Amino acid sequence: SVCPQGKYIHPQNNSICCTKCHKGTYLYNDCPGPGQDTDCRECESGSFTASENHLRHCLSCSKCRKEMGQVEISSCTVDRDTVCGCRKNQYRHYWSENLFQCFNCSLCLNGTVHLSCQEKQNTVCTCHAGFFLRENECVSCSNCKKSLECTKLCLPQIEN
Amino acid sequence: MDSVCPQGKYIHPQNNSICCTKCHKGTYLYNDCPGPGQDTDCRECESGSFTASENHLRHCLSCSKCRKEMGQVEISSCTVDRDTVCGCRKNQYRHYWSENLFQCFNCSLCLNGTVHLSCQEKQNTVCTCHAGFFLRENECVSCSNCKKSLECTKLCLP
Ligand SMILES: [Mg+2]
């Protein structure tokens, strides 16, 4: 025994086919027989189900990582999980396959953009003569001092 | 901006004229350095938390927990500098409902059928059934099981 599309095989009796629960709800109890309803309860706050199903629990909403500078794009609803991301002018730096931190795309004031900021990489910015790139900005050489790793960048230029 | 630091150091939150060495991954910021030539007070992350990079976070990140109801299994446990890695069992594929949420499904074996593409890490086997069989419930079902309303009559004709 198999079931028609949209139905599932009863866990305790394989000769019974039950209709799946609508997204936004979860399986409270399997249907008791052919032509009888599957009992589906609405997901509690903080949980959801995005497709027709027969799960015994709704999924807990995903949480965004505030420490990584993440913001909530969309809030979690009974049939829609939380959507986490970054601001429009920010890019993502993945520390791992699914762990990303939001970083500001360099505006490159007093510099030349050689490659626009991308989804996963910062703007490629070349600061103009008299400035050096640090802390995502083009900083004036008048602030350069020993140990700031700027001495050579600030010395007269050389065509090497 | 005028006050900056060497790569590897961060600007002291109370005085931008002071730069402090960052904490290595696996540790977090206990206390900022008091000034030049003195250490930043960084301490190891406690049980269940981690930091994946050089930082100066006041708290470590909480490790992720694999979703058992989605049939997920732990591929790598969480360490002081690396979050837990979740996956599926052998002969199963991951169906991603979103970028960071996936469900484990069994790959179709395609018995009594033709495999066009083998099962992949994120998608099922592409299978079509031989004459006398019909695809349903991840398998090629014998047409002897075809019954009206099971949507298979025409597929089961000679
Ligand atoms: Mg910096």
What is the residue range of A90's domain? Answer: 86-136
- B48: CB partners within 8 A, 6+ apart: B62, B63, B78
The data reach a resolution, in angstroms, of: 1.9
How far, in Å, is the centroid of ligand 1 from the Cα of B49? 25
- CATH code of the domain covering residue B123: 2.10.50.10
Between CA A2 and CA A104 the distance in angstroms is 54
Three-state secondary structure call for residue B6: coil
Between CA A147 and CA B8 the distance in angstroms is 12
Contact status, residue A21 vs residue A3, Cβ threshold 8 Å: no
In a domain, B156, yes or no: no
Q: Which amino acid is at B157?
A: L
Contact B83 A96 (CB under 8 A): yes
B8 and B80 inside one domain: yes
- B5: CB partners within 8 A, 6+ apart: A134, A135, A148, B11, B19
* Number of domains observed in the structure of chain A: 2
- Domain end point (choices A85, A101, A125): A85
Beta pairing, strands A111-115 & A99-104 = unpaired
- B39: CB partners within 8 A, 6+ apart: B21, B33
Distance of alpha carbon A62 from the chain centroid: 10
Structure-token pair, residue A37: 């309803």
Structure-token pair, residue A137: 């900005």
B46 and B116 inside one domain: no
- Domain end point (choices B87, B122, B149): B87
A108 and A31 inside one domain: no
Kindly list the distances between the CA atom of residue B101 and the CA atoms of A33, A51, B6, B61, in Å, as whole numbers in the listed order.
33, 14, 38, 19
In a domain, A159, yes or no: no
B49 and B114 inside one domain: no
Structure-token pair, residue A57: 């629990």
Of B6, B85, B136, the CB nearest to A149: B6
Kindly list the distances between the CA atom of residue B35 and the CA atoms of A95, A97, B31, in Å, as whole numbers in the listed order.
30, 37, 12
Interface of B with A (CB under 8 A): 1-7, 11, 52-53, 57, 59, 61, 67, 69-70, 82-83, 85, 97-101, 136-137, 141, 145, 149-151
Nearest-Cα residue of chain B relative to residue A100 = B52
Between CA B85 and CA B64 the distance in angstroms is 8
A118 and A43 inside one domain: no
Neighbours of ion ligand 1 (CB under 5 A): A 135
In a domain, B157, yes or no: no
Select from A108, A101, A99, A59 the least CA-distant residue to A80: A59
Contact A4 B151 (CB under 8 A): yes
Three-state secondary structure call for residue A67: helix
**DSSP states along B123-146:** B--EEEEPTTEEEETTEEEEGGG-
Of B70, B101, B141, the CB nearest to A2: B141
A41 and A18 inside one domain: yes
For this PDB entry, the determination method is X-ray
Contact B137 A62 (CB under 8 A): no
